[PDB]
Design a protein around this ligand. Sequence first.
Ligand SMILES: CC(C)CCC[C@@H](C)[C@H]1CC[C@H]2[C@@H]3CC=C4C[C@@H](O)CC[C@]4(C)[C@H]3CC[C@]12C
Ligand SMILES: CC(C)CCC[C@@H](C)[C@H]1CC[C@H]2[C@@H]3CC=C4C[C@@H](O)CC[C@]4(C)[C@H]3CC[C@]12C
Lengths: 179, 181, 245
Amino acid sequence: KETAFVEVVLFETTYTTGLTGRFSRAGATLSAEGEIVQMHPLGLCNNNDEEDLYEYGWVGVVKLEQPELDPKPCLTVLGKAKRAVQRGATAVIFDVSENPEAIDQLNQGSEDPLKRPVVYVKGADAIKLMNIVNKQKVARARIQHRPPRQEYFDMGIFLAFFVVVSLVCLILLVKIKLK
Amino acid sequence: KETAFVEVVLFETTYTTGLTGRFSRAGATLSAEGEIVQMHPLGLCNNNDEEDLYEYGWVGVVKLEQPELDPKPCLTVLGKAKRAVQRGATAVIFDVSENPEAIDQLNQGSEDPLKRPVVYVKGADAIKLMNIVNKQKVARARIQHRPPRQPTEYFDMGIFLAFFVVVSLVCLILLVKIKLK
Amino acid sequence: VILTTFLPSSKLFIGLISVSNLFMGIYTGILTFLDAVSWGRFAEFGIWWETGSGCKVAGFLAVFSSESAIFLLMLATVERSLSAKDNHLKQFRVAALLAFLGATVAGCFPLFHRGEYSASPLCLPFPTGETPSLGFTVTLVLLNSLAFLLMAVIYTKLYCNLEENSQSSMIKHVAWLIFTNCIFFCPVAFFSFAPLITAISISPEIMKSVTLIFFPLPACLNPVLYVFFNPKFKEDWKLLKRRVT
Ligand SMILES: CC(C)CCC[C@@H](C)[C@H]1CC[C@H]2[C@@H]3CC=C4C[C@@H](O)CC[C@]4(C)[C@H]3CC[C@]12C
Ligand SMILES: CC(C)CCC[C@@H](C)[C@H]1CC[C@H]2[C@@H]3CC=C4C[C@@H](O)CC[C@]4(C)[C@H]3CC[C@]12C
């Protein structure tokens, strides 16, 4: 549920547009960068014998379709991400705005973590990402997670319980004097 | 200005070799990744109005030479990084193992921040990087911000309780002199 | 406390210290009011607080309350020392008013500098660090540090001097005040002296939190303990009960 900071860049002067998403507990959460390569959900199957290969390093965008549309999917959602990393991808970005159940499909499969980050972008934020993958000819995507600070909220419990400890003792001193 | 555990990738299969280097204050410390493309210290000049352009995104390795060799460098060390980012780089790895004074050159560039990270790798750890840039035909550099996890807001939490113990205890010995009076 | 006091030289000193305790409480209440109003919207009033006029008033009030907690206590040890040796009850108040009013010029001196308090919502001349008014922060801490030794050496000799049993209650009361003050204030300056030393580094989130709980604490516990630790307080409190009942 950790937020993902993903932005796109456009070489020409480089305009930069950013958006937010949520990391998923399927691949080791860390920063990555590469070119955006849209991948169709049906193109990431495994029964294919030989397929064309891309240059190593590319952030793949996969827009999931409705679960009822596909009665017998070739691979699981985690299988799609595992296939792409083998293909040469470095950070797979999903779009679960149409298949909400994929979030559970990813977070459930915590038994075998993946080596590279996996991100799902839902809501109207994926609409902007699709409007970029649809129009621009070349894009450059970086994903990062840099949560700073928290550093006073952590020591707040230590400071607060201490005053209660100090005051409860003073209560008994006043209680015992009059009795 | 913490360390930077830069790791290189040697694909076809994927073999990963990492090494450590120090971030610099020349540009904001972030995480970047691209194909490693060595440049030359004299190739990052500005008088050349027409130069070959590269694809956007590439971690440039610059092997710094001795400062006394060239009578008058064309641009400052922090100027080479700014020129390289214009060429479409995302990070620069200044091998400063031969020009030690270059570290101070970058660290004094806090007046004008740079949008992209700048790293310098010194010592014999840069020999491993140079051997990779020499032998392998194609590699991929990968640098990440704050590679370790520092519990900055977690290690100091219990220090306050120990600070309070001294305050709670220094008052007790005062009662001894009260009783003696 | 004030109504019970208003005469012995040892009795009139506590009333003036109670005034500084009330000043510190008024200062803390200012911050509490400015906090309770801004439920998550402090930044809207932040520029209005520093760039208005209250950032120079509250800071001066805090400085006046802080320095009174030392200047008023300094004379108590000399009073105790003179009490054990054997027209002085009217000459001690002459120095009392001078010590009380001496902190006004010290607090107003930063105001003459063109911009000192526009660096912290607390409007205090030391949470901002050491760059603003570097010649004032060091001197203020030095003034507090030098005064404690004179109070400590007199109390040290007071016990060795003894072997006025009714006057025994006051001797320990002054000792508690002069000792506990450096338990709540001396650790404060350590964090202020942290950013100016390369070897030791302290995060800013700790300095403000420590200041906000250790600056008003020393001028908050004395009146409460005065009720439960001074036997004369019982008679002083009972004296005024019949004057109204
Ligand atoms: C580090 C922290 C948790 C330590 C807290 C220590 C507390 C519990 C100790 C420190 C000083 C202690 C007090 C010292 C003296 C007296 C007076 C006596 O007539 C009744 C008990 C009483 C009032 C003690 C109660 C307990 C006390 C308040
Ligand atoms: C740790 C800090 C914050 C606690 C602040 C309050 C401390 C200083 C208070 C709390 C309880 C207090 C004690 C309560 C009762 C007595 C008994 C009396 O005959 C002498 C004073 C003495 C022994 C007090 C000394 C001061 C004391 C220890």
